[PDB]
Design an enzyme around this catalytic site. Structure first.
Site: not given
Ligand SMILES: Nc1nc2c(ncn2[C@@H]2O[C@H](COP(=O)(O)OP(=O)(O)OP(=O)(O)O)[C@@H](O)[C@H]2O)c(=O)[nH]1
Ligand SMILES: [Mg+2]
Ligand SMILES: Nc1nc2c(ncn2[C@@H]2O[C@H](COP(=O)(O)OP(=O)(O)OP(=O)(O)O)[C@@H](O)[C@H]2O)c(=O)[nH]1
Ligand SMILES: Nc1nc2c(ncn2[C@@H]2O[C@H](COP(=O)(O)OP(=O)(O)O)[C@@H](O)[C@H]2O)c(=O)[nH]1
Ligand SMILES: Nc1nc2c(ncn2[C@@H]2O[C@H](COP(=O)(O)OP(=O)(O)O)[C@@H](O)[C@H]2O)c(=O)[nH]1
Ligand SMILES: [Mg+2]
Lengths: 429, 435, 435, 429
Positions: B139, B218, B248
């Site tokens: 996503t 997290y 800026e």
């Molecule tokens: N910094 C931080 N990163 C997070 C957190 N939760 C998930 N992530 C990041 O999210 C990544 C997992 O892929 P996502 O972007 O979450 O995927 P999604 O948002 O569930 O969307 P889909 O890919 O369709 O499932 C991991 O690599 C994590 O680094 C968080 O609470 N804090």
């Molecule tokens: Mg997702």
């Protein structure tokens, strides 16, 4: 949303399903009558994924129980946690597959598959957004193998977009509960590698070994083995039936674990596994679970991973834990076992974390390894098949139902091709 | 009257936004239900106001899986957000770029754009966009690429800032991270004004070493990134002795159209018990910001050159000390800028100190500094991803999902060419000039 | 604004530091938690100050075994020290020089240097270094040699003072003392500006005879050495009629680059019951300082010549009396300086009397004098160590540990050559000049 | 930190270990259930060095109990202070070594050594920073000798950097509890001088003599002898399990006491040793302890030190005392016995001081003397071996397990070389 439909073929499939629904109902706090008596709203926030809320505020599992002999069906019906299945679901025949695959896929199955597909279609239209199908069956028994393969082919015809899960109980290497099981295994595997997204291979031998050594049980009844497989399945689905700091769905596992269309056979594993006494004398930390999950003595498939390489690995945790700890553990375990992973897939550990323990415990974990070691399994079966085909033993039972030799020739060639592909990718560079 | 909307894509974006809006509601004395019992207006730039004392955020939480958004709707921050914004899909991209950019997201992109247009037209002095999105998730990558292309088509010349979660070198939760990263980068390379590299591994390291917490959730990483974002926007949202707007930022930190990937850094980060035993000099915290162990991206700055830096201070700060500290930093040799940029700093000072969130992990400080630094070391990181991609493409692994979901192999080859070109540009800029 | 940091290596250093910082906190009216309910600033030279009334020491307690440092963290002086400084290793050198200089200490030397650099850069008028380290222990010898080489590389020209614990002639707790001593001396001979010889045996003797305590613990020896250190630094830390800085020490007491091993001495040391029955004349205490039974190194000064002396007085002292007493001392024959140095004294006077630590053993005095004397008798002591070494090397005893831990026999031979050269230099200087 | 792993081989090793863990638990205030009920935090400040904090706030000893006959294992299990060992640790076989070394090192041991090494590896990875290994075994019994030597060789293969401690109960000179003990002793000593850092020789004869004369006990049960050896071991480790004005670790003792790679055999000693009545009629001062520790009538190895010289000596005190007093005593005792020490090692007394008494006393002391007198011991055994080899008596039992004569020839030559080295250094000048 993302409702899942449960199909149960063969006697083993039906018993596993009975235990599985017991486990799920225990998870969501569902009385045997089918009404909710739980205490946590999160149970009902996704109760729809496996259940349907029938009127007067009751819940019915989205189950479709299939068989060709009313015996085990009636056993399920009479026993507790049977009074909540919707009674119109219990599809069964009279002839019985007779432990034959030809009967289970050509002659007898052709008479009930239509009713089964009709109830399937009704349930599909009932759901809001179908997520996928999970089929629980054997590979030796005639009903399971034949009718499950037929149902899979038909469903894939009518739903080429949904996702497909199978929990096939592979025949054990040492013992042989049946006599013609190589034939059923070969034909079923032919159909599966044709039209399945993922296949969770299981052996009864490994479950025996686990219940004996690790759990310290000298009296493993089938209830316990089915309980273990049910816990594994619940762990697989909790990633979407429950909130989580890093959630997963079945499609996520399919994408991560299946690099190529054919090579989609997974060996599962569960942790922690502690005897009744030896529990308080061990610490329940993420490193402990992680180190437990990587060894031959805790793989539910009877094949040493060390003989091959892990193509990919998925790991679904539960209960409250720290993400950094999990990441550190996965890093260490990927570092020290460098020869145990394939070179050309960097960072080959898919991770998911739920927020609810599987009841009673602090934290659990489920392992889903797609490795190359399983080729041995097929190798074994293939050889056996070859032997029993060289003399054409037992051939007349299968020939008499319309099937002919060329079917067996093609199926054996296909399985050998699959083993060749596994070998090729195992030693790729 | 300088509005700026926030767009959270994917689970990472949504959780980071939970943290960020908790932080904001704490800053301006805003109850979770939008009520409120040096300040100016201040909150108008991020909070729109209705007739009653109820303020609502200018956020658009979009996702394809309703789980996390449902958690938001059920959380303590239920009354806050405008319920129409919490756009939820049905089936998530499942870590597949093609699903997140061609098949599924294509069916709610229009609703998202519609809500964006409503929120924009209700504003007057719109500054720009804040996209909070990861890099590995399906996503995140796909939907963010689609949304950035759409917005760039619609809003011709406006600020577009992203907070990507750069995939770590050694800790990877996904398995197809190289594919999503390469595709989303090839797409966003032509639309994003300024990205903001942050990684989870570096934040783990910082939490363990500096804050002395060995088991972080997290929640903690999210709180840190929220603090960084708040320090970025404190200029708009508060009265400062030397303020700075996002235009800026894009003018200062982006020398060339393509090289716009600055990495974040924050200081001070010290536990409550270690709050004493150090007076926290502004020169000290500047040195902390430039310490290679304090950066929030696993890249040693010493392997590259700082093409530009932007330090935003807040609290009881005095400009002379900042000038002295930056002079000292320029004196040292291990911090070597490019020859062709002799002026490598933008400085901003705010009067409002950072506020500590109750139940948090950090300690109440009087001075804080967020550094956004565009360097050349990050180039090497691309190489790593490139390398990974090559391997996972040499066997055509996982290709069938993307092929069958509305994409072609030639696109993969083209994205690889584009990444090679970007690496080439980084290397070319890194060299020195003659005559 | 004349800062001076303290570096404690090994268990001996750490315990001596416990005593020393207890003494300091008592002197300046500093509570154990850094608060405080003729003085100036005074404490600024050793105590840095944070925003609150909390002061912290400029000490770096480094060890490879966490036991003693953990005792410090658990002691009453827990709130005081900056927790980042209390550097602990994992496995101590176990009285092995190679471990303490090549294998183990090599893995935390960088962290120690980093903390040193932070503390130095937070200061402005840094004077020099105080290394508190033993001589027999493996950590002491090895780690101190490594640290001195590193600091001399980093800080080119600054004061570097050590307080070694010279191995006694007859009481040895270790078994490999000659090896550690010879190696650490061969190393530190080119870097230490001025060492400070002290031994445990002489302090036992002094405690038994003068203080009339027959059963002393290491606490008592530590208190005495802390008193010596406080008398050394009272010039920096207080207003005196004739002050003196550490550079003056190294200029006065070090005639040649190599011969820089002055031994300590303190007076008066009298029990509380014997506090009366004597008026404690400054001439009397000078005579006590020159008494061969009061020196804190088991070497008879009569067997050598005082090449230089430095007497630091404190309390109600008047310079004329000091001049008269020193004249008398110069008159006597048994105290025979070298012919080539006709001026063998540096005198320093402080206005602050020594303060007695409650629960201590000494008595409240109004005048005190610490003598740092560089003589030639100490040369004979080297011979003894040399002798021991020879025997323990004639059989190659214990050699296998050092060989297998990152060292070679040729190094042992070279260190023996170096010690022989030092003894030769002492003998050559001891002779008289012609014409 | 600096966690130590405990191994117990042979029946004697296991009984000594049972008493040893009783003593340690008494030291740290640990209930038989394994939970801490103590009163002083210093007990827990280093509780990790020997214990592991299992979840629910319990403690399990880092023990690895090994045997080839389940008898003594079950005896330990049933008895109190057995219910806290982690039950997965009790590795045992069925054949039993049969008081043979060939069985204990070639045939039977080769089947359990793998499981033992696996549990060893698990415990090693569990620890933060491994300090070293202490092995408690015999030299006569087949299990102890053979399996302990095998484990030592394997561990030294897998951890060539850690430190190795052995408490080997040497056969007594006068009595002979077994018949083939010269063979076991020679082979075990061959392996030990190959791959051990230090070996704490003990005889049952000396313990009998001490319990008889010094303690005034006419009924010395094995419980008491094991209690004495346990007190010695606790005294050895308290230098790191507890704070001290001059602390010591195992590596410190190894460096100080082992001038040459081979000559690392120590005789221990303990003080004070007072009868029940004769206690209040004696003063407990450091001079008293020091003078007690230097005499043949208080050496736990049956050999008069006066027949040779102390190569080196280590001395670990406990309880609150004055360092100057200890230094004075050591000076006096090194002065008056000048002929009893080697010329070319000046100042040959290593000293360590703890801060906690051995529970029930004011101050104690432990002596660890590496002398040349022990050569007599080996001399004795060597001669015996020679005799029993000249006729090749009992040879067939050892030959039948794959071992041959040349093994015995090489082992005897090696032991004679060691005795020659001891003799050479005894009369060095
Ligand atoms: N910094 C931080 N990163 C997070 C957190 N939760 C998930 N992530 C990041 O999210 C990544 C997992 O892929 P996502 O972007 O979450 O995927 P999604 O948002 O569930 O969307 P889909 O890919 O369709 O499932 C991991 O690599 C994590 O680094 C968080 O609470 N804090
Ligand atoms: Mg997702
Ligand atoms: N004056 C004094 N000396 C001490 C004290 N404690 C220990 N020592 C000296 O320390 C020496 C022992 O070696 P150490 O330097 O302590 O060894 P360590 O500091 O523990 O470091 P390692 O050698 O690695 O164990 C002895 O010779 C003592 O003289 C003390 O409290 N006062
Ligand atoms: N794990 C598990 N496997 C079972 C159980 N019962 C039967 N099986 C397996 O199922 C196979 C028999 O198939 P079955 O369904 O009974 O025959 P069918 O009627 O022809 O399908 C055998 O190979 C068994 O290994 C059970 O309770 N648990
Ligand atoms: N100190 C001591 N020694 C013992 C004890 N029990 C047995 N031994 C010694 O152990 C030796 C027997 O070894 P054992 O372990 O029983 O035989 P194994 O099974 O072949 O190893 C004999 O020489 C005894 O001297 C005991 O309780 N204390
Ligand atoms: Mg030490």
């Amino acid at each position: 949303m993302r409702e899942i439909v449960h199909i149960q073929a063969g006697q083993c499939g039906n018993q596993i399903g009975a235990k599985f629904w017991e486990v799920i109902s225990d998870e969501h706090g569902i009385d045997p009558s089918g009404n909710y008596v739980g205490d946590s709203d999160l149970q009902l926030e996704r109760i729809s994924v496996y259940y349907n809320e029938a009127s007067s505020h009751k819940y019915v599992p989205r189950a479709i129980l299939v068989d060709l002999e009313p015996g085990t069906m009636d056993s399920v019906r009479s026993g507790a946690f049977g009074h909540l299945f919707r009674p119109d679901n219990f599809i069964f025949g009279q002839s019985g597959a007779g432990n034959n695959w030809a009967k289970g896929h050509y002659t007898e199955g052709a008479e009930l598959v239509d009713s089964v597909l009709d109830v399937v279609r009704k349930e599909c239209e009932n759901c809001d957004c179908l997520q996928g199908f999970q089929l629980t069956h054997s590979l030796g028994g005639g009903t399971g193998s034949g009718m499950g393969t037929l149902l899979i082919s038909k469903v894939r015809e009518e739903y080429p977009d949904r996702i497909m899960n199978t929990f096939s109980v592979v025949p054990s290497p040492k013992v042989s509960d049946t006599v013609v099981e190589p034939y059923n295994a070969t034909l079923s595997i032919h159909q599966l590698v044709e039209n399945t997204d993922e296949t969770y291979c299981i052996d009864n031998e490994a479950l025996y070994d686990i219940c004996f050594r690790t759990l310290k049980l000298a009296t493993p009844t089938y209830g316990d083995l089915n309980h273990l497989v049910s816990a594994t399945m619940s762990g697989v689905t909790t990633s979407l039936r429950f909130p989580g700091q890093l959630n997963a769905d079945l499609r996520k596992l399919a994408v991560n674990m299946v690099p190529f269309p054919r090579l989609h056979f997974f060996m599962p594993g569960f942790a922690p596994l502690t005897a009744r006494g030896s529990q308080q004398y061990r610490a329940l930390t993420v490193p402990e679970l992680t180190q437990q999950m990587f060894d031959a003595k805790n793989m539910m498939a009877a094949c040493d991973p060390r003989h091959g390489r892990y193509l990919t690995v998925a790991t679904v945790f539960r209960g409250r834990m720290s993400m950094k700890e999990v990441d550190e553990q996965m890093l260490a375990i990927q570092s020290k076992n460098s020869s145990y992973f394939v070179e050309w897939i960097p960072n080959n550990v898919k991770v998911a974390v739920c927020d609810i323990p599987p009841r009673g415990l602090k934290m659990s974990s489920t392992f889903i390894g797609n490795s190359t070691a399983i080729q041995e399994l097929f190798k074994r079966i293939s050889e056996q098949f070859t032997a029993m085909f060289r003399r054409k033993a037992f051939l007349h039972w299968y020939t008499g139902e319309g099937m002919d030799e060329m079917e067996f020739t093609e199926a054996e060639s296909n399985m050998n091709d699959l083993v060749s592909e596994y070998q090729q990718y195992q030693d790729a560079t | 009257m300088r509005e700026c909307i926030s767009i959270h894509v994917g689970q990472a974006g949504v959780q980071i936004g939970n943290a960020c809006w908790e932080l904001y509601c704490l800053e301006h004395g805003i109850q979770p239900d939008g009520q409120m019992p040096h300040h100016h207006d201040s909150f108008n730039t991020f909070f729109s106001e209705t007739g009653a004392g109820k303020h609502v955020p200018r956020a658009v939480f979009v996702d394809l899986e309703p789980t996390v958004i449902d958690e938001v709707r059920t959380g303590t921050y239920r009354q806050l957000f405008h319920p129409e914004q919490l756009i939820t899909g049905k089936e998530d991209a499942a870590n597949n770029y093609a699903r997140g950019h061609y098949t599924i997201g294509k069916e709610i992109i229009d609703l998202v754009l519609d809500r964006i247009r409503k929120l924009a037209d209700q504003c007057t002095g719109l500054q720009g966009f804040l996209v909070f999105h990861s890099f590995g998730g399906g996503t995140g990558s796909g939907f963010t690429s689609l949304l950035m292309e759409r917005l760039s088509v619609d809003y011709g010349k406006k600020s577009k800032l992203e907070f990507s979660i750069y995939p770590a070198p050694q800790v990877s939760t996904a398995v197809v991270e190289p594919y999503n990263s390469i595709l989303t980068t090839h797409t966003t390379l032509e639309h994003s004004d300024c990205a903001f590299m942050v990684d989870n591994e570096a934040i783990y390291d910082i939490c363990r070493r500096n804050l002395d917490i060995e088991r972080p959730t997290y929640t903690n990483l999210n709180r840190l990134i929220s603090q960084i974002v708040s320090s970025i926007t404190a200029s708009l949202r508060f009265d400062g002795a030397l303020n700075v707007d996002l235009t800026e930022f894009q003018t200062n930190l982006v020398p060339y159209p393509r090289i716009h990937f600055p990495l974040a850094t924050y200081a001070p980060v010290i536990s409550a018990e270690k709050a004493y035993h150090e007076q926290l000099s502004v020169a000290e915290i500047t040195n902390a910001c430039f310490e290679p162990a304090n950066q929030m991206v696993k890249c040693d700055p010493r392997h590259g050159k700082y093409m530009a830096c932007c330090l935003l201070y807040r609290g009881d700060v005095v400009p002379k000390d900042v000038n002295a500290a930056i002079a000292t930093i320029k004196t040292k040799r291990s911090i070597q800028f490019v020859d062709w940029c002799p002026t490598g700093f933008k400085v901003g000072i705010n009067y409002q100190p950072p506020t500590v969130v109750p139940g948090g992990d950090l300690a109440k400080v009087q001075r804080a500094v967020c550094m956004l630094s565009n360097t050349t070391a990050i180039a090497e990181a691309w190489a790593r991803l490139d390398h990974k991609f090559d391997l996972m493409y040499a066997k055509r692994a996982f290709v069938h999902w993307y092929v069958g979901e509305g994409m072609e192999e030639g696109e993969f080859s083209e994205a690889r060419e584009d990444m090679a070109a970007l690496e080439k540009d980084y290397e070319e800029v890194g060299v020195d000039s003659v005559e």
